[PDB]
Amino acid sequence: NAPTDAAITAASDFAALEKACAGRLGVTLLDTASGRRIGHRQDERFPMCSTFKSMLAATVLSQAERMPALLDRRVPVGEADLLSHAPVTRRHAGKDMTVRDLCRATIITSDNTAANLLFGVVGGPPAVTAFLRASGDTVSRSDRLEPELNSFAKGDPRDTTTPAAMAATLQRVVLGEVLQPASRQQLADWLIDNETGDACLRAGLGKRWRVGDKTGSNGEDARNDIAVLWPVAGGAPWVLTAYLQAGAISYEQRASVLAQVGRIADRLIG
């Protein structure tokens, strides 16, 4: 492990970082003032894994804008809905939860049961995909429920995005005018409050950034983190998306790679 860790740490550009972990790394660093992007394999497909939940929540918020009170609707949590990863919803088996609280749960803990219950509210993966298309994203696609959506095969586009497509979508949805201001700010706040990314992009980013992010992973080789970076001193935000497949290294080393993406990005912003 020592040499791999050392090579990861020594990598000062994305191509070298990819090589250090013998992986496939997709990164977009997007300057929202200019539209300029820097990165690596920006237009190759990667499994979204849980990073899609950002846009499931956005789908809910968008529908709520035309169905006021949707966010206060209560949804039963049944024993049959519960999955291995259900850290919030497991406490509510046999009772119900508000749609808003399911949205929070699925962003900040990546609760899989919460995501499936929200899929049921909005009309499923097809509804999330229709939301993405209407927002201007022709690339990203939601196709399956949890946990099957975390499968990936090369050439199978189900539940995939590209780093550049997800970066642009984060800009339009979290910063732009796809949602009404109150909705987009609620979504931003959930991303800011995320609890699952402390070892990933956040670990490599300095204190000058307020970070909102959403992580994802699977059991084979995938580890992802997508983030919005607000300068606390003011100025234009940046977006940083990072998708990794690297089966030759450990789960914990995959986080160390994403942390290093953060370090490289911070230096490239300068």
Residue numbers in the entry: 20 to 57, 59 to 238, 240 to 291
Provide the authors' own sentences about this structure as they appear in the paper.
Of particular clinical importance is the widely disseminated class A SBLs, including the mobile, plasmid-encoded extended-spectrum CTX-M and carbapenem-hydrolyzing KPC families (both produced in opportunistic Gram-negative bacteria, such as Klebsiella pneumoniae, Pseudomonas aeruginosa, and Escherichia coli), as well as chromosomally encoded L2 from Stenotrophomonas maltophilia (a lung colonist of cystic fibrosis patients). SBLs hydrolyze antibiotics via formation of a hydrolytically labile acyl enzyme intermediate, while MBL catalysis proceeds without a covalent intermediate. The diazabicyclooctanes (DBOs), including avibactam, relebactam, and others, are a new BLI class with improved activity against a wider range of SBL targets than classic BLI scaffolds. DBOs inhibit SBLs through covalent formation of a carbamyl ester to the active-site serine concomitant with DBO ring opening.
